[PDB]
Each structure stands twice: as structure tokens, then as C-alpha cells.
């Protein structure tokens, strides 16, 4: 298994933040241009999932920087995608977001711990530890604690996302828009400047 | 911003997660009182006398374990086959456990192990679980003073506290509920699948066609509206019907749920065909062969002919071979899950009248509650294979019920997956806002103002994939402090003050409007009443587009204006909502008029003058076209609207044509 | 096994609206089609009856009837700041 | 690409809890250390105690299914040599019809989980043999099931 | 999403019934009333039947396939030190090398049909180890099996 | 569960599993083998006198 | 070998334009020239011999 290579990656989903500083003077944007003026988020951190969008912990101060670099989506509207925009390894076809609820660690009562083989969930048909044949009896399970059907047992949802195969797009314009050859800052009114110190 | 509750209402997953592999109709081990039968043994032991097991002689002190855990279901013996054990140990629920299936049984590991233990005790520090070290001994020994009565099993009793979840029982035999050994044709049923969530793409979430709150976009100078909507307008099928266009609406997205409420080809559509059994499976007994006979060996020394006396070197005597065959018990595996699956999703999502009441088991008050939909278990028999096999053909027994609340849909199973499995959430997201007057402008600057409402109601906000309410049931949604992300690009400041002069005059505005930009009118049609037209009085219309009627439910919406309302105790599937107008071939014939004069295709242009048939069946081979129900009226008339086909020929669409929304996707002939 | 039988045929049709034109041609060229504003059909008034019929009917429904209506806005700004609104619904008697 | 059934499956019996062995209860104190009489308020010997393993009848269930897929898929349109019709019984006689190839018996024991096994080839003789005239298809299935069954 | 198996399945024994007991006939001629003796034509001394329920055999076919899917090939590309393998059987060194992992198991119960069931989730467990050490490419699907297969 | 060698009574218990696949293939273009980018094995690719 | 065939009746049927005199009047004689006739041909223009 090969991210790089191949071209399917899969790491571009665990990174928390991308602080670029221009010779440790004020930020990459210097126009208080999006919602943080030092940083850039990826992964956001657990503090206000409110700002985050798309049923997720995902980060809006970027949600509108790979949301417009392949194709425009955070100016003229929260628009869909075709399918020829949307590449086999662009941003929106293989990334697909994802969340979980089942067990809450600290607002329940008996739940102390539920160890790794002190289960008995589906044991005796299944084996002890290897794939052996009916080792045991039917006894009732302990396990996945339930919140579903007839139960009440509380519980707290966890927002991770995932990116796969999807390369982090993204314009280097103030306008944020990846058109032309000539970019909007890449090549403005003191951005074609001399050699100066880079320390991100 | 907040937290939702969801209630005992919801189950996403329909199997089962606990004991789903032991017996579908076998109770665990627990006894009974009027004498016991049930008991079973895992553990093995080396020599047990006055405590539990002895499990290992470790180092120079024997060694008998703790009541906390004792008989793991996990351990069985390394041997698969007929083996013998000299001590063996195992659980035997006591008896405030009654006789209960294994398939669907939740239990509370209280201590610290996962070996489930009893909760209350004496005084001081109440931590013991009481489970019995009462020993099991064998018929060999009752007489003798000194006499070893050694036993086979210990059976260890426990009292936990526990409930069932995942299933509950169709067929009970008796009403006891303490203990009972009639509980042995007790089985499990499990509970119907069904997810709530965000109705598909946002939609329910606010208001759209009621304005006693009204969506009033007005400024610090202006006094004026944004929102000026009725009971005879559009807003809600808005959304789907023009963004139609723009990709198909099935594309995989979290925000919206972008993929929409979509039924299967393969289940709404019976693709009855058989099965593909024409080979029998096996299902051999342990390793081959169960038997014990005596076989000692022969060869001849002696007697020359037929008969001979043994072998020279014998085999030793317990030899436990066949003569004949290794068994086999046959199954036809293919013809086993078609019955499953089959019976499954055309009866679960019926409705409730011909299914099952109370037999030996609690239940609910209303018919669309979820627990008294639950527990009702039709025949497989209608359901089953043999209906109509080898035809492509949905019955008329299928096609009148709700054909959206589903096993698997686009849209209704992707939301509740990926918003949290349970009740009690923390999570947010952006949330829309789809007026025609208010989505492609771009705002000039100065002094402004901006006032919202949000139905409250959780019945109507979120929707049911069997069909069963929330506010009626137990549901309540709890909200915080709302925002607003604008999102607008950052102009040159020289261009941003000066680019306005387009919308700073009067002269040019940025105007809107809906692709079916229509007014309706809502009208009741009850049981025994299958003629209703509509009489409007003298009226000055003067543009006009066409038509367009399909059919909408009482039972599953009433005429809404508001949050709060009593008569919605449905919370399926909306014709007006998630574009679920699943009963529109239940036109037989349509005939319009005017003012006061006679019927609208006066005109003279097809066989029948006046009344456009829908729906002709078997009138006259030569009404309805193409092996198609639809009379000739009405089957030109679909491809004469937003298509250019009829007076060319007969084309057939390319692949874009067909936007998810439209004619071909959506209907399919059949036949029986 | 031979036996006799006459067969039932039906059509499915679900998810979709039963979409007519207003036209003598009856075909949707753009928005406004020919009769929509024609000679016969333009500022005088008239008034839609109907003689619908229905497959035998179980439940209580509400036949749900779309007239093809034209409601549009213009979003005017005289002053910064000052938004002047006019709306009309036009074959339902409102505009404006 | 093979069977892919690395756990096994198994036809599972009634209950679990099936052998006719007899059992009492036990305690001590008529005899304190070594030697025991009967146990306290002790139940009749109606007891059906399973002691040790259970029974497990074994299956591979994703083989068995191949099985199927792989012989109802080709073999009755495969090519008549190894075929043969089966003695004691009567066939009305022409090839393509209802009667003779539809009931000419062939193995299995070779169209399986095992010819060619982890090689993507069709075999030689199923492209001699029309694909189009075989069980299931996609041209016929939208008519046939379009006109009536029967 | 669990399971669905709602109808139980079973792997019938063979022909039926085999526990048969032994059954003679009897005629309402020679006594009236509650009298019986020898009958005119026999059922033979060998009447195999087993009255009353048939023996039946559990499988819960959907949990054991699924179980296997998530086994097969989503419990055998994890962490590879917490993994699993039997004491006894003898074994090569390394981790990347085929002797040392083939053997090598986690348990069947760990990676099943429950694990935070209900949600379309996917834990940090698999998805910072590549998906392409995983059964499912279908661009090495390919040429795996078109050059050889040996 | 026995050292002992080929045979002895336990190993009747003894149990049969599948080994691991391994697909020996090529990537989604099979590069891997031209030197394209390597600033060693580079190819020069020039004229008859140039 | 168990079938047999018979259809019952035949009918005509086309799709006609309800057409406007006002162009349809020229436009049938814009067809009726030496000049203007359309002429059609397939994809394939395959010549078979058996």
C-alpha cells in the first residue's frame, strides 16, 4: 500500500491546522480575509462544532478554499457539482463524510468497562480465539450497549471525517480563484518581489 | 445549534446484535417452579469436592475461581467431536429470569469483568454476586456412606438485571411471566427497521406556505416584506423540481441530503424469476459419521477359504467408521433467503388492518403507533415466492400502499447513518433557506433587517422510514442560538463602491421566479365518492403554462399553515415534501373545461374528442398503446410537453433527457 | 400443466406530475406557450371547470391540482440601504 | 478469485441441549470432607443436561452457492459431448427442444470453484457457445416478462 | 446494519425422519367398542414413520457471511502486533513476510456484525493504513490474472 | 494443541483455515520500471551530432 | 412443438401534425421541387453475401 505512487491517497483527512506565516509577519490572508486571520484548520478541534458545516467537524475557514479552487463553490452560491467537474480524484466523488454513536464513557451507571474477551455477545458458535468450531454455550450479550429501539442508555456523537484519493486543492489568490496562468497574488503588486525568508 | 432527541421510535439496523447466531427458538438456561429441565456446560474442570472447580494446580496451592466470571461462552474444548468430560461448569439464569430466546438478549456487566453479575447485596459493601456453586451430580451414585457422588456438572445461577431490545415474540404458549416451562415454542421476531432524521435535501425544516410568522426580509429605513405565500402556492416542491436540472439528485453529500428518497427497482417492481437451486447444498453432521461399533480385525493364516480366524497385529477395538455413506443433510440454500427477503419488505411497510392482534403479550392503543406495527406478523404465503412468478410485474395488491418508506433508500438511509446512531446528539450543521425572491442576489450595502420563525412540531420536521410518529410516541427537539453564514466575494474596494450602478437604478432588477411557478387548490375525495370535478366562479387569468394533478394523502399531512397541529399523527412519506407523488396512475379518465361552455379539446385531435383517457384496461387492443395501459389520449400527451415527440415519430430520449424527476426514469410497464 | 387464463395488464407511473401544454399545437415552446397569450386566451375573462374521474377510491386523499401560475419579483434599490417590493402571481389574479 | 469463507458455518441442531443423561444434585454434611448422600430441597432427574461441546454440522456456505451460480449459469448451454441422457427414463427426441438437452444430464464437477481457479479466462468452449442464449439475460428478460407469464 | 434473516433457515436431514418406531393395524370388526385384533391387510412390521414434529437445524445464514466479510477481509489488514496467532505451530520472522502473516488471526467475535452498529461509520482503524494492501482494488483485480496465474 | 510429529489423538481436533491473498500486479499505469523522474538513471535523448 | 400463431386484425396509425395553414400551405410546395428532395442513408451502407 502506496499513497503517493499510486494516487490513491488516503491520509489528507488527519491534519488539524496549516498555520502559514510569511517570514513571521502577519498571515498568508493580511486582510482579516476569512474566520481566522493567523490560522488555517483542517481538522477542526472539538471547540465549536456550530461553525462547522456538512454534518461533520469540518472547518468552515477552509470549507471555502478546496471548495474553490477545481470548481468555484463559496461566491455565487452552495452550488452541486457535475460529473465532469467532479474528477475520479477531485474533491467531492471520493470523499464521502462519515459519524458514529453508540456508548458514552462517563454519563452512564455499570458501564465501569466492557473488556476486549470478557464479552458474551454471540460466543459458543463463535470461537474463544481462534477460528475453531462450537467451542461453548449461548449465553446473553454485554457489549454494544443499545440507545436504539426500546432502551435507554446516553450517548455522545463523535465527528471525524474522511478524505480519500482527494488532493488538498488550493488557489493562490486573495480572490481565491485558481484562473490563468497568472494568478491574481502570484503575480500582483509586490508578490513577484525579491528572495525574502519562509518559515511556516 | 442543540441537541435532538429521537426517542423509542427508531432502529436503523433490522437484524439483531445479541445471540443473532444460537437458536432462533431456544430459551437460555434458566428453571422453572410448580422441577427443572434446561442446562448447559462449557468449562472443564480436573477434580471439584467441597468448592465450584478446581481449575489448576498452581505451583502448590489449589486454585478455585471467583463468581464474578466462571463459565465463559467464549471456551468451550479443543476437540469438535462426541468428547467426554469428568467435570464440567456452566450458567443456569436463576429464577427471576424467565424462559427467554437467546436471539435478542441485552445484559449489564455490573463489575469489572464482562461476566454479568447481580446488583444488590447484604449491608457493609454490597459487591458479591450471588451466583451458586451448587454442584450436579450423576444417577451412578445415591447409596454408600464414604461412597464418591462426584459430580458432572456445577450449574451456576445468576440474577441480573436485564431487558430485551432487538426482538419481541410473535407466538407465545402461555401467559406466566415468573417462570414457566411453557415457554419453548417461544421464538424471535425482530422489531421493524426504521430511521429518523432530516427530511431529504433540508426539506420540513422551516416554513415554506404559511405566513401567520412570515420569512420578512425588511430594512432599518424599509418597511416592506420578502415573503408573501398562501395555501394555493409552491415553495416546498420548489427545491427538487428546478435543481433537477443541474446534475441528477442522487450524488453523495452530508450537508443536504443530496441523494433523494428513492425506492428500489428490485423491490417496489417484483423480479420474480425463482431461484438458481438446481444443485443440493450440504449440511454434514460434525466431521461425517456418529457411531459407535465394535470392529476387530481379520486375516487369514489358517482357514484358507472365506472364513478366517483375526488379524496378525489387531487394531485396537473402537473403531468409529461408516460401513456406508458419510451422511449428509441437505438444504437448497437459494430458495431459503428469496422467502426471507421477499416476505419481508412487501409486508413490512403494509398496512395494519388484516395483520395480527393481542396473542399472549403486551400491546399499544393506536394502529399507528410503532410497538402495535411491530409485533403483527402476516402469513408467507401472499408475500412469498410463488405470487406470480416470471413476470416483471408490481400487483394491484402492492401498488396502493406507501412505496418510499423503505430497507434501502437514497435518501432516507443516509442522513441517520451519518448524523448519530441514538438518541441524545450534540451536532450541527448549516441549515437552508429556499425562497425564489431571496436565493441568486447579491445585496447592496447599507441599513437592513431580517426576521425568521422555524416550525416546531417534530412529527412534520423529520421523517419515518416505517411510518410512525415521534411527537405522539416520545420526541421532543430542543434549539439554541441561531446564526447566519454569509458568504460574498471579496471585491476591489475601487470596483465594490462603483460595480453597484447596475442595481443602484430602478431600471434594471434581479428578478425571480420558480420553474413551476403554479397555484393549486386542495380539495377531499373520501371512500364511495370516485367523481369530483372542480367549479370556479367568473375570473380575469390571463397567462397560462398547462396543467399538471397527481394525489396527496389526508391520513399522512392535513392542510398546513403552521407549527402546531393535532391532526398529523403520521410521520411517513409526503407526496408534497420529497416529491412522493407515488399514486398517480390512479386516473381513469380526465376531461377539462372553461367558463360555462363546453370541454377543452373541442378542437378535434385524436380518437377519443374529449375525455383523456389514463386508464383504459382490456377495452380494446387498439386504445391502449404499446403493451401499456395508457389509452393513446394520454400516452402522446407525456412526450408532447417538455418533449418534442409525436408528430416526428417516436424517439427515444438520450441520456440526459430523462432528468431523475421525469417520465421514463420513475414509470415501467408490466404484465401478468 | 395446461391451463387457461386471460391476462390483466396495468402501467406504473409514480414520482411524476401529468404535465399538458397551452397551445393550438399543444407542445411547451419556452415559457409562454401560443394559446397562453394569444387571441382568444389574453386579458379577457374565463373560468376552468373539469368532469375528472379517478380509480376506485379506498382512503381520503386530496387530489392535488396544479394550474400552471407565473409569480415573479424585482428587487429594487433606489437608495442604499432601501428596498421598494413589488410582486405578481399574474393567472391567479395577482401582480403588482 | 476463489472461495472467500476463511470462518466456517454451521447447520446448528434444534437447540443446542440434546442427550438423555440423568442427573441428580449434590452437598456434604452427612459426610463432611470426602463423601456426599444427596443436596438440599433437590429437584426430580428430568434433566437434559448437554455436557461439554455442542454440536456443529459444517458447511461452506460462499463454495456452495458457487456451486450453484457457476452450474445453473453455463452448463445446460454448454456443448453436448460430455452430456448424456439418463437411463430409465423416457425423452421425447429433438436437441434444442424442451425435452432432450434441457433434461441430458452434466456434472458440476467441473464447471466449478476449481477450473482455472484465481485466473480470469473465459473458457474456450463457452465462447464457441452463443452468451445471448443462455437462462438469464437482458434482452429477453424485458420482454418475456412484459407479455404474460404463460 | 445487522442482519436480515426474520424466516430461521434449516438444513433438513436427510429424507426427512430417521427415528422411526415400529406400527401394526388394527380392525373395527372383530371388536365394537374398545376391542381390537388382527387387521384384514397389515401395515408392515417395518412402518417407518415419526409422529409428530419434524427435527429441525438452525442456521442463521446472514450473520456468518457477514461475519466472514468483515473478517476475511477487513479483520486481516489492521495493526499488525496486537494481531493474533496460535503458540504451537511453527513460524517465520518477519511482519511483511507471507509465513508470519497468513497464520496470524484476530479474533472472529472482535471485527463482526456489531461493532457500533446503525451508523455508516468508519473507524480510525483501516483508514490510516492504505486501502490498497486491501481486497477490494479493482485496478490490480486486473492484471493479477491476465499475464498468469502461476 | 500437539508437538508430537504427523499424528496423534488431538489432532483430530485440529482445524484447517485459508491463507492471505496477495495480488501480484501491477499499478494503475504499471510505472515502476522507466527511470523518468530518478536525477541518476536520467535519459539524455539528444541528436546524431547535436 | 407447442406454438402456434394468429393475430386477429391489423390497424393503421400515425403521429400527424395539427399543421398551420399559413406556412404549411408553402411549405408543401417547398417540398414539391426537383430541387428540394431529401435523400436518407445508414450508418452501415453494408453490402451482405451469404
Same mark, same amino acid.
Given at each position: ?30 486582510? @482579516?480575509?476569512?474566520?481566522t486571520?493567523?490560522?488555517?484548520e ?20 477552509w ?9 468555484n ?31 458514552? @464513557? ?8 466492557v473488556?476486549i ?25 454485554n ?10 442508555? @446516553? ?22 480563484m ?12 509586490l ?6 525568508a519562509?518559515?511556516? | ?12 439496523? !433490522?437484524?439483531t ?6 437458536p432462533?427458538?431456544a ?7 410448580? /422441577? ?15 468448592? *465450584? ?9 489449589? +486454585? ?35 424462559? +427467554? ?5 441485552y ?33 451412578e451414585? /445415591? ?51 426504521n ?19 412570515? *420569512? ?18 409552491? /415553495? ?50 460434525? *466431521? ?8 476387530? +480385525? ?5 482357514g ?99 412505496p ?19 438518541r ?11 425562497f ?20 416546531k412540531?417534530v ?29 460574498? #466575494? ?21 428578478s ?36 399538471a ?5 389526508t391520513?399522512?399531512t ?11 399523527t ?11 407523488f ?22 378535434d ?21 404499446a ?7 394520454? #400516452? ?18 438520450? !441520456?440526459? +433527457?430523462?432528468?431523475?424527476?421525469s417520465? #421514463?426514469?420513475? #414509470?415501467?410497464?408490466? !404484465?401478468? | 400443466?395446461?391451463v ?15 404535465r ?27 373560468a ?14 386530496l ?34
Amino acid at each position: 500500500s502506496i499513497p503517493y505512487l499510486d494516487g490513491t491517497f488516503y491520509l489528507n483527512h488527519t491534519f488539524k491546522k496549516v498555520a502559514i506565516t510569511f517570514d513571521s509577519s502577519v498571515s498568508w490572508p493580511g486582510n @482579516d480575509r476569512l474566520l481566522t486571520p493567523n490560522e488555517f484548520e483542517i481538522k477542526r478541534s472539538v471547540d465549536g462544532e456550530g461553525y462547522n458545516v456538512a454534518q461533520c467537524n469540518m472547518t468552515k475557514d477552509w470549507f471555502l478554499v478546496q471548495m474553490l479552487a477545481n470548481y468555484n463553490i463559496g461566491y455565487q452560491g452552495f452550488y452541486i457539482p457535475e460529473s465532469y467537474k467532479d474528477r475520479m480524484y477531485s474533491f467531492f466523488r471520493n470523499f464521502q463524510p462519515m459519524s458514529r454513536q453508540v456508548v458514552d @464513557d462517563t454519563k452512564y451507571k455499570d458501564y465501569q468497562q466492557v473488556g476486549i474477551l470478557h464479552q458474551h455477545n454471540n460466543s459458543g458458535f463463535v470461537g474463544y480465539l481462534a477460528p475453531t468450531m462450537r467451542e461453548g454455550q449461548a449465553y446473553p450479550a454485554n457489549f454494544p450497549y443499545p440507545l436504539i429501539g426500546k432502551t435507554a442508555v @446516553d450517548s455522545i456523537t463523535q465527528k471525524k471525517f474522511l478524505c480519500d484519493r482527494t488532493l488538498w486543492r488550493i488557489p493562490f489568490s486573495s480572490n481565491f480563484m485558481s484562473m490563468g496562468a497568472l494568478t491574481d497574488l502570484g503575480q500582483n503588486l509586490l508578490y513577484a518581489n525579491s528572495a525574502h525568508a519562509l518559515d511556516m | 445549534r442543540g441537541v435532538l432527541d429521537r426517542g423509542p421510535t427508531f432502529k436503523p439496523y !433490522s437484524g439483531t446484535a445479541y445471540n443473532a447466531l444460537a437458536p432462533k427458538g431456544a430459551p437460555n438456561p434458566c428453571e422453572w417452579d410448580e /422441577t427443572h429441565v434446561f442446562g448447559q456446560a462449557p468449562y472443564s474442570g480436573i477434580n471439584i469436592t467441597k468448592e *465450584g472447580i478446581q481449575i489448576g494446580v498452581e505451583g502448590q496451592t489449589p +486454585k478455585y475461581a471467583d463468581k464474578t466470571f466462571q463459565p465463559e461462552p467464549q471456551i468451550g474444548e479443543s476437540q469438535w467431536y462426541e468428547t467426554e468430560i469428568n467435570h464440567a461448569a456452566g450458567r443456569v439464569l436463576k429464577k427471576t429470569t424467565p424462559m +427467554k430466546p437467546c436471539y435478542g438478549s441485552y445484559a449489564k456487566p455490573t463489575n469489572e469483568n464482562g461476566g454479568q453479575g447481580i446488583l444488590v447485596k447484604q449491608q457493609n459493601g454490597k459487591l458479591e454476586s450471588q451466583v451458586e456453586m451448587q454442584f450436579f451430580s450423576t444417577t451412578e451414585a /445415591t447409596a454408600g456412606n464414604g461412597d464418591n457422588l462426584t459430580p458432572k456438572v456445577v450449574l451456576y445461577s445468576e440474577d441480573v438485571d436485564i431487558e430485551t431490545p432487538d426482538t419481541h415474540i410473535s407466538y407465545m404458549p402461555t401467559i406466566k411471566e415468573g417462570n414457566s416451562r411453557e415457554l419453548m415454542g417461544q421464538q424471535s421476531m425482530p422489531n421493524r427497521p426504521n430511521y429518523i432524521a432530516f427530511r431529504d435535501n433540508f426539506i420540513g425544516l422551516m416554513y415554506y406556505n404559511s405566513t401567520g410568522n412570515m *420569512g420578512v426580509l425588511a430594512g432599518q429605513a424599509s418597511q416592506l416584506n420578502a415573503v408573501v405565500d398562501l395555501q394555493d402556492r409552491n /415553495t416546498e416542491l420548489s427545491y427538487q423540481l428546478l435543481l433537477d436540472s443541474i446534475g441528477d439528485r442522487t450524488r453523495y453529500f452530508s450537508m443536504w441530503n443530496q441523494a433523494v428518497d428513492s425506492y428500489d427497482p428490485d423491490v417496489r417492481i417484483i423480479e420474480n424469476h425463482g431461484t438458481e437451486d438446481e444443485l443440493p447444498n450440504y449440511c454434514f453432521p460434525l *466431521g461425517g459419521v456418529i457411531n459407535t461399533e465394535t470392529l476387530t +480385525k481379520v486375516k487369514p493364516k489358517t482357514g484358507q477359504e472365506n472364513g478366517w480366524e483375526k488379524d496378525a497385529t489387531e487394531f485396537s477395538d473402537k473403531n468409529e467408521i461408516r460401513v456406508g455413506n458419510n451422511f449428509a443433510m441437505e438444504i437448497n440454500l437459494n430458495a431459503n433467503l428469496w422467502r426471507n427477503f421477499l416476505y419481508s419488505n412487501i409486508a413490512l411497510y403494509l398496512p395494519d388492518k388484516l395483520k395480527y392482534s393481542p396473542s399472549n403479550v403486551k400491546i399499544s392503543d393506536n394502529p399507528n403507533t410503532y410497538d402495535y406495527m411491530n409485533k403483527r406478523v402476516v402469513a408467507p404465503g401472499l408475500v412469498d415466492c410463488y405470487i406470480n412468478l416470471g413476470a416483471r410485474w408490481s400487483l394491484d395488491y402492492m401498488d396502493n400502499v406507501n412505496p418510499f418508506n423503505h430497507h434501502r433508500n437514497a435518501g432516507l438511509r443516509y442522513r441517520s447513518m451519518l448524523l448519530g446512531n441514538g438518541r441524545y446528539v450534540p451536532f450541527h450543521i448549516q441549515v437552508p433557506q429556499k425562497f425564489f425572491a431571496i436565493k441568486n442576489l447579491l445585496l447592496l450595502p447599507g441599513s437592513y433587517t431580517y426576521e425568521w420563525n422555524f416550525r416546531k412540531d417534530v412529527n412534520m420536521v423529520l421523517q419515518s422510514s416505517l411510518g410512525n410518529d415521534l411527537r405522539v410516541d416520545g420526541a421532543s427537539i430542543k434549539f439554541d442560538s441561531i446564526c447566519l453564514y454569509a458568504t460574498f #466575494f471579496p471585491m476591489a474596494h475601487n470596483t465594490a463602491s462603483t460595480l453597484e450602478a447596475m442595481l443602484r437604478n430602478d431600471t434594471n432588477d434581479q428578478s425571480f421566479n420558480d420553474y413551476l411557478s403554479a397555484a393549486n387548490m386542495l380539495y377531499p375525495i373520501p371512500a364511495n365518492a370516485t367523481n369530483v370535478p372542480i367549479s370556479i366562479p367568473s375570473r380575469n387569468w390571463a397567462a397560462f403554462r398547462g396543467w399538471a394533478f397527481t394525489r396527496l394523502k389526508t391520513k399522512e399531512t392535513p392542510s398546513l399553515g403552521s407549527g402546531y397541529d393535532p391532526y398529523y399523527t403520521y410521520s411517513g412519506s409526503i407526496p408534497y415534501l420529497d416529491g412522493t407523488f407515488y399514486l398517480n396512475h390512479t386516473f381513469k379518465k380526465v376531461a377539462i373545461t372553461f367558463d360555462s361552455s363546453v370541454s377543452w379539446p373541442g378542437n378535434d385531435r385524436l380518437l377519443t374528442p374529449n375525455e383523456f383517457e389514463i386508464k383504459r384496461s382490456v377495452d380494446g387492443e387498439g386504445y391502449n398503446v404499446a403493451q401499456c395501459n395508457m389509452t393513446k389520449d394520454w #400516452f402522446l400527451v407525456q412526450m408532447l410537453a417538455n418533449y418534442n415527440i409525436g408528430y416526428q415519430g417516436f424517439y427515444i430520449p438520450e !441520456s440526459y +433527457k430523462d432528468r431523475m424527476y421525469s417520465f #421514463f426514469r420513475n #414509470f415501467q410497464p408490466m !404484465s401478468r | 400443466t395446461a391451463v387457461d387464463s386471460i391476462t390483466q395488464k396495468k402501467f406504473l407511473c409514480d414520482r411524476t406530475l401529468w404535465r399538458i401544454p397551452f397551445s393550438s399545437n399543444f407542445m411547451s415552446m419556452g415559457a409562454l406557450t401560443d394559446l397562453g397569450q394569444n387571441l382568444l386566451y389574453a386579458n379577457s375573462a374565463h373560468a376552468l371547470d373539469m368532469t375528472f374521474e379517478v380509480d376506485p377510491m379506498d382512503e381520503p386523499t386530496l387530489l392535488y391540482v396544479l394550474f400552471e401560475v407565473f409569480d415573479v419579483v424585482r428587487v429594487h434599490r433606489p437608495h442604499r440601504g432601501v428596498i421598494e417590493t413589488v410582486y405578481l402571481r399574474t393567472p391567479f389574479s395577482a401582480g403588482n
